[PDB]
Amino acid sequence: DIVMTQSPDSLAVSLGERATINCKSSQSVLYSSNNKNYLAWYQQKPGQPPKLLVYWASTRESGVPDRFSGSGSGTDFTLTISSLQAEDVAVYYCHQYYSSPLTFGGGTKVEIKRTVAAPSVFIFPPSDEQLKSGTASVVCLLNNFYPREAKVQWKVDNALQSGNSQESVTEQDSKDSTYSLSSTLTLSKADYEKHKVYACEVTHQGLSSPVTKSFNR
Amino acid sequence: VQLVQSEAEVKKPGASVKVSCKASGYTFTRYAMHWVRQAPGQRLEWMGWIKAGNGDTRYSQKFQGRVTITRDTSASTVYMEMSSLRSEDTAVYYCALLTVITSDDAFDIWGQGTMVTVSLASTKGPSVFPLAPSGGTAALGCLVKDYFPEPVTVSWNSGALTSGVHTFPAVLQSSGLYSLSSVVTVPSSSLGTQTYICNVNHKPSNTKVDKKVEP
């Protein structure tokens, strides 16, 4: 098969800077008879299908911003984003349609650098409907922060918790280049009724001291 | 042109799945429809194509044994069938009009994928729980907890509320069940003046909920 190898595996640059992605094919995809390279570039964002950017190695797809450009021939190909924009955060794939089976590269992840942004923190008590089922889920939300590194510590009656929470972070926002995070602390309804104060303590580069959001049951 | 694919599925190992792909916006028979799969953290893999005109097919040497691609011109729909499913077949499955390059035009449409999970674990619908809100902006949301398999989709106010929405990737709980939350930042004035419902779909369990989130 034709192996498609991309480099680097991930890139991060500030807004308006140039991003370069290399793709190398294990066989030439140039046909001398028509001087065409049977290569295409795709953009993919989380939860969405790929979108065609460039074809014949260097012909931009219709409707694609002109800051996107493809170059190269034979076995060595380049996708250029001349002035990286907020919406361009995604994974980029080269693709060959020279030979069966069609194949794709391993992808290059393009990330945006931006200024520090401290999270806005919210805490949500368990709903009365859930406590009926015998469980309490307490949710702490960290909204639109940069960089992605953030620490969430749960406290119940001011006691530091461990082993009863799970968190996940979003992909990078395509408009403001921030991240958000959700942490869930899960207790039996019986344990939840044994305490008064529920808090999440948030530490982030944007904060000189931790921010605590709390409620009393 | 739009390509609309079948609903998310779960299957036992050794079973079969058949994924639909309905086309619109162009003459159905003129182009070939491909199937491409994307396994988690692995590269896109091409499976096969079919000529929507004459019904001719080509398959990769991976899937030639276990994959059959068909089409219905009257229904303007392409189908992909996998037999002898293995846990490694857990992936998103795409139909796409890959690189239609012609003298008249050049276009490339993909469907929204179809998640299929090959697993021996049981299917479970989720419970949706309000994340009750309580200066100018407030946070509310929904907690979608204890479901299998992935995915769950969530929309707000039937899709006209999209700004300020964060739907988080699911976590894997110790039970083997997934859980996720979706939040959105809204005006605090609209707390007492406007309505907010999260629309939750878990197709494998045929679960559909509209959850009003109130203070």
Place this chain on the structure above:
Amino acid sequence: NPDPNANPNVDPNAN
């Protein structure tokens, strides 16, 4: 040489 049946949607005699 390229295989025109790798992707039949590609016409090699077209920009």
